[PDB]
Amino acid sequence: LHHAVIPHGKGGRSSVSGIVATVFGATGFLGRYLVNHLGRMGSQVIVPYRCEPYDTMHLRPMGDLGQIIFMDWNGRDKDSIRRAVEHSNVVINLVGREWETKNFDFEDVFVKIPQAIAQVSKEAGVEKFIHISHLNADIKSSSKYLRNKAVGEKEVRETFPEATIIKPADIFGREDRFLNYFANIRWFGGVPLISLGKKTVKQPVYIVDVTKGIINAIKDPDARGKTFAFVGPNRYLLFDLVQYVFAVAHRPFLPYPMPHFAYRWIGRLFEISPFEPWTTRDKVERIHTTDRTLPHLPGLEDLGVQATPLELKAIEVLRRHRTYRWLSSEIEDVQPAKTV
Amino acid sequence: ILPGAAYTEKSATYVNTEGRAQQTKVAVMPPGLAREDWKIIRALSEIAGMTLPYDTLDQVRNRLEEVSPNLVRYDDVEGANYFQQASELSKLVNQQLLADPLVPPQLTIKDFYMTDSISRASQTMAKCVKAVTE
Amino acid sequence: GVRTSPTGEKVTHTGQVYDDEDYRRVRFVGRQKEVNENFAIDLIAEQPVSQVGSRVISCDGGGGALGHPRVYINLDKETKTGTCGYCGLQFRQQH
Amino acid sequence: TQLITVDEKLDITTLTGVPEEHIKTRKARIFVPARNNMQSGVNNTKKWKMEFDTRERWENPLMGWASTADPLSNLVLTFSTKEDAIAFAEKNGWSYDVEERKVPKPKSKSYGANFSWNKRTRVSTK
Amino acid sequence: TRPTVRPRNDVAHKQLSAFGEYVAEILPKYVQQVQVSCFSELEICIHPDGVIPVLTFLRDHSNAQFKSLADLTAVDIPTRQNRFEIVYNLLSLRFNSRIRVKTYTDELTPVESSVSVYKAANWYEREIWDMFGVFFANHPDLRRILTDYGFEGHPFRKDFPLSGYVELRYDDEVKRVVAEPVELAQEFRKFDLNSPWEAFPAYRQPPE
Amino acid sequence: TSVKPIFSRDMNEAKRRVRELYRAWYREVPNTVHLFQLDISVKQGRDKVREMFKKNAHVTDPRVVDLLVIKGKMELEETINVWKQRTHVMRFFHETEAPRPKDFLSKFYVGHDP
Amino acid sequence: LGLREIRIHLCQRSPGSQGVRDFIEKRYVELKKANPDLPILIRECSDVQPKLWARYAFGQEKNVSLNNFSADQVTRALENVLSSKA
Ligand SMILES: NC(=O)C1=CN([C@@H]2O[C@H](COP(=O)(O)OP(=O)(O)OC[C@H]3O[C@@H](n4cnc5c(N)ncnc54)[C@H](OP(=O)(O)O)[C@@H]3O)[C@@H](O)[C@H]2O)C=CC1
Ligand SMILES: [Zn+2]
DSSP: OOTTSSOBTTSSTTSBOSOEEEEETTTSSHHHHHHHHHHTTTOEEEEEEOSOSGGGGGGGGGSSTTSEEEEEOOTTOHHHHHHHHTTOSEEEEOOOOSSOOSSOOHHIIIIIHHHHHHHHHHHTTOSOEEEEOOTTOOTTOSSHHHHHHHHHHHHHHHHSTTOEEEEEOOEESSSOSSHHHHHSOSSSSSOEESGGGOSOEEOOEEHHHHHHHHHHHHHOGGGSSOEEEEOOSOOEEHHHHHHHHHHHTTOOOOOEEOOTTTSSHHHHHHOOSSSSOSOOHHHHHHHTSOOOOOTTSOOGGGGTOOOOOSTTTHHHHHGGGOOSTTSSOOSSSSOOOOOO | OOOOOOSSSSOOEEEOTTSOEEEOOOSSOOSTTOOOHHHHHHHHHHHTTOOOSOSSHHHHHHHHHHHOGGGGSTTOOOOOOOHHHHHHHTTSOOOOOOSSOOOOSOOSSTTTSOOSTTGGGOHHHHHHHHHHOO | OOOBOTTSOBOOSSOOOOOSSOGGGTTSTTSOOOOOSOOHHHHSTTSOOEEEOOSEEEEOOSSSTTSSOOEEEEOOOSSSOEEOTTTOOEEEEOO | OOOEEOOSOOOOTTTSOOOGGGTTTOEEEEEOOOOOTTOOOOGGGSSEEEEOOOOOEEEOTTTOOEEEOOGGGGOOEEESSHHHHHHHHTTTTOEEEEOOOOOOOOOOOOGGGGGOSSOTTOOSOO | OOSSSOOOOHHHHHHHHHHHHHHHHHOTTTEEEEEEOTTSOEEEEEOGGGHHHHHHHHHHOTTTOOOEEEEEEEEEOTTSSSOEEEEEEEEETTTTEEEEEEEEEOSSSOEEOOTTTOTTHHHHHHHHHHHTOOOEESOTTOSOOSSOTTOOSOTTSTTSOSSOSEEEEEETTTTEEEEEEOOBSSOOOOOOOOOSSOSOGGGOOOOO | OEEOOSSOSSHHHHHHHHHHHHHHHHHHHHHHHHHTTOSOOHHHHHHHHHHHHHTTTTOOOHHHHHHHHHHHHHHHHHHHTTTSOHHHHHTSSOOSSOOOOOSHHHHHHHOSOO | OOEEEEEEEEESSOGGGHHHHHHHHHSSHHHHHHOTTSOEEEEEESSOOOEEEEEEGGGOEEEEEOTTOOHHHHHHHHHHHHHHOO
16 A cells, blocks of 8 residues: 555544545535545545536535645546546545436436446546445336436446445435425425325435445445445334424424326426426425335445434424524424334 | 564663663654554454453553563663572583684674664665775 | 656656655646756756865855855865855866 | 641642543653763753653645644653652653663763873873 | 943842842741842742732832732742742832732642732733633632633643644534644644753752 | 642532532533524433533542532533533534544554554 | 463562572572473562462463562472462
């Protein structure tokens, strides 16, 4: 092993971790906390960014001097990927879009770009690659997201035979689109569901648990080539989950059934703007998709991570949405939601 | 290969030729991933299911005092008595002296500068040998 | 007098250039390794040896109070020129 | 009476704010500092010094400086007697070891011995 | 000695020696030593049971009149068993003069607060709580004043290192500025500058 | 051995003062969780206050536990009056710190620390 | 299983080691001829109490006090060590 990448120090900010990471999609939600958790070990983190540099500014206080290297990249560009991953020893792929745009469908984001990154990481000599797929990703799902992500899963597995594929089930956090989606349908008209949302089952996994799983996947040589399934400790129906969301935020709650006659058409009624979409038909088909149980896969128990449940962090998430009249409330006020 | 520590790189009890025990202090840490030697042997005893009854260096020194207690009393010469009993035990095995002369292998100035594992790896000692053999 | 490594990186006058597998070339990806190109050891070789006629010469680097402190150089060695300790200049007794 | 009896051990390890990691894993060393053999002066060898063990000093990957993680690395305390230093090390609970003051033996120099008659201690030149 | 050497003020030395004998022979219960420096300043080294009865003399007596408390100072010396050397500096505007009153304590013996004599010390010895840990009983609001609120320890004690035991950095995980163990990017390079030749022979300490 | 006391004559009054300080913190913890709008529970906060009290559990010196009472009163006054912030209270819950090695084998693996 | 080495610690100038000294001044040599393959390590030290360490197989070490003992008592303890082999 090379003399500059030998791990030194007491594992703090100015230590050396022995990790040179290339974190694709680092300017989103998971890349935020991943660069935050890698920078406190002193890992030389290459951050490839596509967006404005200003939108990357919040990544700068996350490490020591020279421990985060920002560089431009494009998704359809082999040159930028080979320019970015040639010096690394772990390449984490967090590239995802919850919505398709004019320039990128789900096939570009989930099939083209991960196969390009995994192909270059094989043909440039990277020891560890890590890919992030969704737990409900299947070939014959009714959503474009899970179909393209399962096809990209199979491609990344077959073109890089040691790619650590990770399945987080459903991630909730501060800048998420899971609890922030369930809390930001309050003044639209009454939180629409299908058959009152008691037909689909979820288990939300907490983002610090997923990030510590990614850290322990970088650390563990036994974790090469596996397919990890990160899930939370408690399974919930969607109906009592949304009960708990509107009961932590202390909000009015009058749900109604909106059937398949017109709740896929409220996509093309409610993304008539070309901006960042509030909902879409893929979001409808994924929120109303149950979380499949895969007990044979190794999970957060098999990487030394205690999975933190929903109730200990939902107040930390959803304090933002209370008006004023119960900002001085507690966690010991709301009764915890029913598990299944 | 298990990489070890040097003499400048570990707190370390040595003995001179007169029985005086002394200890070094850590000038620099050992380079790379190389650890201190008894730390390595104790970790090997932990892996092999034969865990030695110490964790820290002072407990190693208490073990050392159990084995021979003059090795925890630094900069103190203890007078070893009882030459008579060793003399009487030397009268048993009458080994025959050879006729070959007692010639030490360090005859010249060339034989000094390269003796042990450190002095052979020095470019300065190489310049000394190159300078005294020209 | 700058030469170039087989990796594709310039060489300083100290002699430092990174390995092919050292990750710390990634700070130069998309940027440039600002090295100097006026090497002092190659610029002091262009100075001709000052032919003087004394035995002890006094060198101060020129300028008077703007050079190095004034030292004295013995020149009795005819095989070796008398190199100044500070400025790198060198003198020669011509006889 | 306004004076209480305290026969307990004088310990302030819970009052100096020092974390436990830098108490029970640090080896304080009380020593008269040896004379630098480049020099002939002994004014530096007058007062006792308490130093500590050296922890790790690694290379900063940006520049090449000696980064460290030890706060008590640069700490060298000055004392006048050995007993004050031992009482200070037993006051703050630091596990210590003590070297002794090794003064030179008073030499028997005689200038006539440079020019003797029958002794081996003559000089071959001057 | 004409251009560069400081002119010696024998008048100030004789007057401060007379006033030092005065303060000594009035208060033999607390005044331990009386010294006058070579640059004409007075120091009344006392016992810590005489914080109030000495200063109340110097605040009030008609030939002292030291109405102003200029600066209260603690000096930590590790080699003494009473390690803290609390220093009162008094200014008399009428007698145009200054006096220095020097008391001592260790970490655990409390020194009596002098806020009843001079209210100016309401922060100063309070600072000596924060910077050294000397406790001052009968003080109204005795708490830390210069360090941060979550600061454990006392900084100006000489066993406290130069860099602390905690550093602050912002952390986007908990969205908060948090304290972690310090890892300096460059070590503070200590320079062994003390030259081993005796710089001042008149300050020589006689041997053991 | 005859030194001046601070507030306690012997260990009994010192235990009384430590006991009243623990009473004050036991009363204090729900207010600290409420008005600072923390993310912790009263069970977790009171167990952390129990850990902070049991951290100093080896002292038999009355002056030392008197100064610990006084510094706990300073922490209490900095907590009742809002002088600490959210961060100065959450510095006790060392959450951002990575889990440190405890056994011999991991301390052998990561560095040269005893 | 069996004895592997013996360690006899003593002082030089203490009277408490005196009879222990009396073990080595008269009785060691014919012991060493009796046990030529058995290392009996004698260690003198500054002001230690006399001590006997008997190392057996697999690391077991018996710990016998030897303070204030005469040479008969040291001899009886050492022959108990040689006869036990525990
Ligand atoms: N529901 C969930 O939260 C779960 C998500 N995952 C997966 O984990 C990954 C991370 O999720 P998350 O952080 O929430 O997503 P985000 O939307 O928060 O961030 C995704 C990042 O990818 C970048 N990106 C996406 N497409 C492109 C593109 N074509 N060109 C350049 N940059 C691109 C974005 O940068 P820019 O701003 O420049 O476009 C952004 O920084 C995704 O792949 C997701 O599928 C897995 C399990 C659960
Ligand atoms: Zn010159």
